[PDB]
């Protein structure tokens, strides 16, 4: 096949101008989409706060209007999903991944409204859910929609505009362009065969997405954490140990989301009214915990600079980790619309901080800042649970600009994915696709 | 396919422990190797410096001892490549690329000593070439060497260990662990068919490689440029224009490297003595340039911060850019062992800084710093000529740490890789692998 390859080599990277232009408009719309979705989630959480002040005297009334305001919004999003778009429950990444294997449909006429307005429901109630799931599936479908509109043919185009959509989608959720592109290249593309996902075109989509985000967001970065200390060579072995800790917990967490998916399906069996009611209970519990124990609820982007700085006690870190594991499972395993990615950064940090804390007290000769161990462990549930270590390392890198920590971030990351592999664990997004293709068959 | 897929998903990212443990040995070896390559080169540039001290009075004599010292060292490397391993000429990234498509041999028992010691000659005489060619080829060969020694069977084991070695080698040359992983993913894996390269094992080898770099180098990074200003959004269109300029020049420079590869071959006809004699005059010229005007010679990493801080006049920059476009084509089209990746970084930094200075005077309302256009231009030739923009960006990112410039950098990058596609350029590493398979069926 020598002569064949000489031909292909000379034809490499010649994406059709049609796809390059269209990836631009996908990026842009996904950008405006995520920006709108981001503004809307905020506005709801705010109206929720100003309610607790029209009533801030009667504390039992206070705990009540906190619960019902989230419950109602939870339910509204659960309902929007079962009634009109069931594959828009949960993250949506496993679907958009299925769409790339050509095994799941991109029902964009249903999912765009269902995910967007249904996500605003669950996120806006203050449930423990990220915006990544929403934006990524929303972005994916937006790619499909502009395909079907301009009726472009080829595999290249269907897969590209699907990729650049969900890529631009993740980018716009975190202001993380590099992280989006890598997410397609490492995690989303079809993993057992070749593909015609133009990477140059995913690049154009991500650009536009990210520019649109800079137009409605500037002067504030999602997280500021400032410059932390370096790490000496003789400290690296501590980050490897922290990777191993993630590597055994990573898979353990994966078992729980699945068994909790099962456990919560026993609660409604499929019944849209038991389900929506159950979601409202979950919602209201989060909005209640949102008032009374805020670090145990919400997406988690907030307490990440607090937890780097070392402002929490060790007892608090232990509390938050247990409590947030529990609400993370309740919210994500329930099937409410919304990703798990962003709350796994939170669980990661908290754990890394707690470790840096013990590490600082054991080794004063090392001159540690517990904040470095938190940054290494932020991308570490991503490594050990969804097994996209290159994505999380660069995602964290983009969010925290502490490049002098690249070696320990990497080292904790592979430690995580190595022990996650070796203790018998599977990628989370992949093992959700499969259970969903194995119900898309066991019914026959 | 649904039954097939479901079964494959439940089995994903289960790289055999044998491969992973062997990836760790590959990275360790390449880091040590690459460190050693780096220390050697400097030691020889040092000797050439202190030898100009013992002859620092006779200005004609001085010019001659610099010419000869490098001329001699040049020839030693041209010889070591023609006599014992021809596929160790030039970069060797095309070579490792062919090897991953199963279309070229990894003659490691021949190439390791040739590329290592031949590289020491051309680099150490201060020729316009980068340790990256040498280190990526050495790394891949080191990855084949442990595959053989330990008799690991399989297409996966052969493709992975060959890859993590070449990533380990780019990392070690630039202290760029991500930029190494991304090189394999974006440019060096088989580009048109699926492959069983294990990313988790490339990562492991790059860690070990880079850890070696930090044990013998730390508290010093290759380039330090400071923290530059941010990029207002009403400034970004200026960065699309730069990538367009880089996007048209990229292919023209690609022609010139392909074309002059041809023209220097007519000089020696293929003959090892005219060739080694030609290389000594190139490498002799370089070590001479390196005294009467050091910015027209060398790998070029030197003048990237000197350019970014606008410490050059507009004239000097125009010079340095044309002079270095010359001495880059002479050194690399000549067959001399050594990468083009670093001398391209220095070309784009020079181009960008010049562009920055024009902007600063046309638009005082934008409060510009020319240094931010250097950092977007640094990796723009990489984007426009070898057409690995992701790897390029993330490389310069890991080398300059001005992450606030990620958007202008990403934009000049696509600005180049788009206009390079639309003016009919090619991935120069794939264009060389092509012209080398075209002679292998004729």
């Amino acid at each position, epitope marked *: 096949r020598r002569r064949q390859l000489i031909r292909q080599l000379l034809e490499r990277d010649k994406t059709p101008l049609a796809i390059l232009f269209m990836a631009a408009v996908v990026g842009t719309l996904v950008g405006l989409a995520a920006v709108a979705f981001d503004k809307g989630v905020a506005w709801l959480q705010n109206q929720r706060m100003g309610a607790l002040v029209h009533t801030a005297d009667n504390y039992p009334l206070l705990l009540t209007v906190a619960f019902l305001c989230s419950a109602v919004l939870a339910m509204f999003g659960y309902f929007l999903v079962r009634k009109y778009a069931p594959e828009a429950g949960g993250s949506g990444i496993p679907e958009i991944e299925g769409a790339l294997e050509d095994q799941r449909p991109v029902r964009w006429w249903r999912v765009l409204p269902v995910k967007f307005f249904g996500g605003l429901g669950t996120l806006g109630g203050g449930m423990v859910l990220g915006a990544d799931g929403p934006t990524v599936q929303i972005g994916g479908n937006i790619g499909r929609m502009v395909l079907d509109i301009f009726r472009l043919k080829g595999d290249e185009a269907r897969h590209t505009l699907l990729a650049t959509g969900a890529a631009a989608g993740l980018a716009a959720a975190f202001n993380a362009p590099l992280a989006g592109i890598l997410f397609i290249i490492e995690e989303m593309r079809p993993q057992f065969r070749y593909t015609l996902i133009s990477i140059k075109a995913v690049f154009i989509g991500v650009i536009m997405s990210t520019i649109m985000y800079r137009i409605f967001n500037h*002067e504030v970065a999602l997280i500021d954490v400032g410059k932390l200390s370096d790490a000496p060579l003789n400290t690296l072995w501590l980050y490897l140990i922290l990777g191993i800790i993630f590597g055994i917990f990573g898979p353990i967490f994966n078992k729980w989301v699945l068994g909790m998916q099962d456990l919560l399906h026993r609660v409604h069996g499929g019944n849209i009214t038991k389900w929506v009611l159950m979601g409202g209970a979950i919602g209201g519990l989060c909005g209640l915990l949102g008032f009374v124990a805020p670090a145990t609820s919400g997406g988690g982007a907030n307490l990440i600079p607090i937890a780097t700085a070392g402002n929490f006690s060790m007892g608090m870190l232990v509390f938050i980790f247990v409590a947030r594991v529990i609400t993370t499972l309740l919210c994500f395993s329930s099937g409410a619309p919304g990703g798990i990615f962003a709350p796994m950064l939170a669980l990661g940090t908290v754990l890394g901080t707690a470790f840096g804390m013990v590490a600082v007290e054991l080794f004063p000769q090392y001159h540690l800042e517990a904040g470095t161990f938190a940054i290494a462990g932020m991308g570490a549930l991503l490594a050990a649970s969804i097994r996209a270590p290159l994505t999380g390392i660069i995602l964290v890198l983009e969010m925290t600009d502490n490049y002098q920590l690249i070696l320990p971030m990497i080292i904790t990351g592979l430690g995580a994915t190595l022990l996650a592999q070796f203790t018998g664990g599977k990628p989370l997004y992949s093992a959700i696709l499969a259970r969903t293709l194995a119900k898309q068959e066991a019914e026959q | 396919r649904r039954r097939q897929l479901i079964r494959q998903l439940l089995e994903r990212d289960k790289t055999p422990l044998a491969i992973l443990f062997m990836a760790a040995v590959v990275g360790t070896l390449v880091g040590l190797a690459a460190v050693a390559f780096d220390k050697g080169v400097a030691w020889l540039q040092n000797q050439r410096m202190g030898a100009l001290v013992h002859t620092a009075d006779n200005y004609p004599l001085l010019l001659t001892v610099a010419f000869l010292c490098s001329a001699v060292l040049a020839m030693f490397g041209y010889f070591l490549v023609r006599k014992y391993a021809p596929e160790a000429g030039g970069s060797g990234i095309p070579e490792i690329e062919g090897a991953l498509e199963d279309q070229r041999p990894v003659r490691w028992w021949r190439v390791l000593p040739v590329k290592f010691f031949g590289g020491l000659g051309t680099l150490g005489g201060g020729m316009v070439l980068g340790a990256d060619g040498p280190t990526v080829q050495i790394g891949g060969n080191i990855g084949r060497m442990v595959l053989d020694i330990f008799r690991l069977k399989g297409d996966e084991a052969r493709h992975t260990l060959l890859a993590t070695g070449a990533a380990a080698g780019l990392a070690a040359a630039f202290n760029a662990p991500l930029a190494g992983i991304l090189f394999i993913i974006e440019e060096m894996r088989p580009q048109f068919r699926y492959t069983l390269i294990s990313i988790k094992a490339v990562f492991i080898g790059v860690i070990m490689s880079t850890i070696m770099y930090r044990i013998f180098n730390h508290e010093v990074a290759l380039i330090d440029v400071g923290k530059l*200003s941010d990029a207002p959004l009403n*400034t970004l269109w200026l960065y699309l224009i730069l990538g367009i300029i880089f996007g048209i020049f990229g292919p023209i420079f690609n022609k010139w490297v392909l074309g002059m590869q041809d023209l220097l071959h007519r000089v020696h006809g293929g003959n090892i003595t005219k060739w080694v004699l030609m290389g000594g005059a190139i490498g002799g010229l370089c070590g001479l340039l390196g005294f009467v005007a050091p910015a027209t010679s060398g790998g070029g990493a030197n003048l990237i911060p000197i350019a970014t801080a606008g410490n050059f006049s507009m004239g000097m920059l125009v010079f340095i850019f044309v002079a270095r476009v010359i001495t880059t084509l002479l050194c690399f089209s000549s067959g001399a062992p050594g990468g083009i990746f670093a001398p391209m970084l220095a070309l784009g930094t020079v181009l960008g800084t010049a562009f920055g200075m024009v902007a*600063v005077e046309l638009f*005082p*309302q*934008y*409060h510009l710093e020319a240094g931010t256009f250097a950092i977007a231009g640094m990796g723009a030739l990489l984007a426009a000529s070898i057409r690995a923009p992701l790897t390029g960006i993330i490389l310069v990112l890991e080398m300059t740490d001005n992450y606030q410039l990620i958007l202008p950098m990403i934009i000049t990058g696509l600005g180049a890789t788009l206009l390079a596609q639309f003016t009919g350029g090619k991935p120069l590493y794939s264009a060389i692998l092509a012209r080398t398979l075209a002679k292998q069926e004729a």
Partner: antibody
Amino acid sequence: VRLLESGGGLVQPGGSLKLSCAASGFDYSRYWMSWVRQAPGKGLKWIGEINPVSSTINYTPSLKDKFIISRDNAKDTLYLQISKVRSEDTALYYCARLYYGYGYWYFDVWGAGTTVTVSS
Amino acid sequence: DIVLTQSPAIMSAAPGDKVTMTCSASSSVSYIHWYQQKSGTSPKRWIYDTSKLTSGVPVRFSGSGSGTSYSLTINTMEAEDAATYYCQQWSSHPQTFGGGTKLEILR
């Protein structure tokens, strides 16, 4: 985050004076600073700017060395020297930290002012 | 230099009036800024990029315009809004300031 300018007061026509501006509250480097003046009862007029590394220094259309702006990042202080002073330099001088949103620049944070009187 | 010129040099208003002052430019400017200078204070960045409010500026304020006509508007002016307001461009160099619209209160 404060800006405290000083050094104003009396000068004879034709003479000169050096205003200082004491910055505090922010990384004063990596920040353009600028001088704006306000003749008594009149409106605002830009004097000039200086980028953080003292590489760039722009001025309103003045004469030769009418104004000499300068920063001592080491002491977090902005400087302005006015010379060949005439009765139009009697004004209130404001130190200001420059910044931007979309990229069209503005006078982010102003000081209180120091006052210059050109009188014999 | 772009010469900016502001609508009334002086204007009076009763709290509860909608108030509108206007910045007009000799050439095209874009994304202009507004500063409020209460008596005996330094100018305070009020509105930037035509219509963006500095943090702490109350919502009763708004900006708009384009090309050569820009305005600042107080929707139901309040008594504490009495100040001289200055517009400023830096879309061309050198940047330049308007002349002032002094807001006076009727009570």
